[PDB]
Amino acid sequence: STKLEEHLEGIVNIFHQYSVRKGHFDTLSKGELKQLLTKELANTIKNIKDKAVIDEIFQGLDAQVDFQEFISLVAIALKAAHYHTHKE
Amino acid sequence: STKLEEHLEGIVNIFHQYSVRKGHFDTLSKGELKQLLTKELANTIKNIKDKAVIDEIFQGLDANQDEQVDFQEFISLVAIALKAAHYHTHKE
Ligand code: NA
Ligand SMILES: [Zn+2]
Ligand SMILES: [Zn+2]
C-alpha cells in the first residue's frame, strides 16, 4: 500500500476495533460511536472553535451505525483537520 | 494526536505535497488529481464502477483538466476511497 492507502486502512482498522466489540462486527451502537469520537478525535474536537461543527459531528447520536455513516463523520473531521493545519 | 488523528493529518499532508507544487498552493488541477488517483490509489480504485463514482463527483475527471480542485472536493475522493478500502477488507 501507498502512504495514502496506509492511512485509509488504518481508519478502517480503527473502526473495526470498535465495531468488533459487541453485536455485529461491522456496526456500532450510537453510544459506542459517541465514545469512539470523543476519545479518538479528542484533540480535533478541542481545536474546533465553531460549536455548530462539533454539533455536526455528534448530531443524532442521541436519536446501529455503519461504516458509510462513519465515513460522513470522518469527512467532517478531515475538513476541520485541514483548516487547523493553516492556523497562524 | 491519536492514531486516527495522525491518519487525518497524513491525508491532509498528502494533499499538500501535491497542492504546494504549482499554481495556487492549496489546490491542484484535475490533471494533477488524476495523477494522485492513479499513483496514490493504485491498490484501492481499480475498476470501472469505482472510477464511475469518482467521475460523477468531478464531472468526469478527464474533462477540463486545468480546473482547480480544493481540499473540500478532495475529501469527496478520500470518502469514495475509504469505502473501497473497507469493502476490500471483506473480499477474502
Ligand atoms: Na458491533
Ligand atoms: Zn467491515
Ligand atoms: Zn491546505
Which numbered ligand comes closest to the C-alpha of B89?
Answer: 2
Distance B13 CA to ligand 1 centre (A): 31
H or E segment to which residue B28 belongs: strand B28-29
Residue among A88, A73, A17 nearest B75 (CA): A73
Q: Rounded CA gap, A80 and A76, in Å?
A: 6
Contacts of B37 (CB under 8 A, 6+ apart): B45, B54, B61, B77
Nearest CA in chain B to A75: B75
Looking from the CA of B72 toward its CB, the CA atoms found within 13 Å total 2
> What count of other Cβ atoms lies within 10 Å of the Cβ of residue B89?
14
Contacts of A88 (CB under 8 A, 6+ apart): none
Q: What dihedral angle (degrees, nearest 10) is formed by the CA atoms of A48, A10, B90, B34?
A: 80
Residue among A47, A51, A69 nearest A60 (CA): A69
> What count of other Cβ atoms lies within 10 Å of the Cβ of residue A88?
2
Q: Rounded CA gap, B90 and B92, in Å?
A: 6
Residue among B9, B69, B46 nearest A6 (CA): B9
Q: Rounded CA gap, A42 and A36, in Å?
A: 9
Q: Rounded CA gap, A37 and A33, in Å?
A: 6
CATH: 2.40.50.100, 3.30.70.20, 3.10.20.90, 1.10.238.10. Which one for A1-88? 1.10.238.10
Q: Rounded CA gap, A65 and B43, in Å?
A: 27
**CB-CB contact of A28 with A65 (8 Å):** yes
Take residue A10 and report the three cell numbers written for it.
488504518
Distance A20 CA to ligand 1 centre (A): 5
B91 beta partners: none
| Cβ distance of A5 and B79 shorter than 8 Å | no
| Cβ distance of B79 and A75 shorter than 8 Å | yes
Q: Rounded CA gap, A34 and A15, in Å?
A: 12
Task: Identify how the structure was determined.
Answer: X-ray
**CB-CB contact of A4 with B40 (8 Å):** yes
Q: Rounded CA gap, A16 and B66, in Å?
A: 39
CATH: 1.20.90.10, 1.10.238.10, 3.30.2320.80, 3.30.470.20. Which one for B1-92? 1.10.238.10
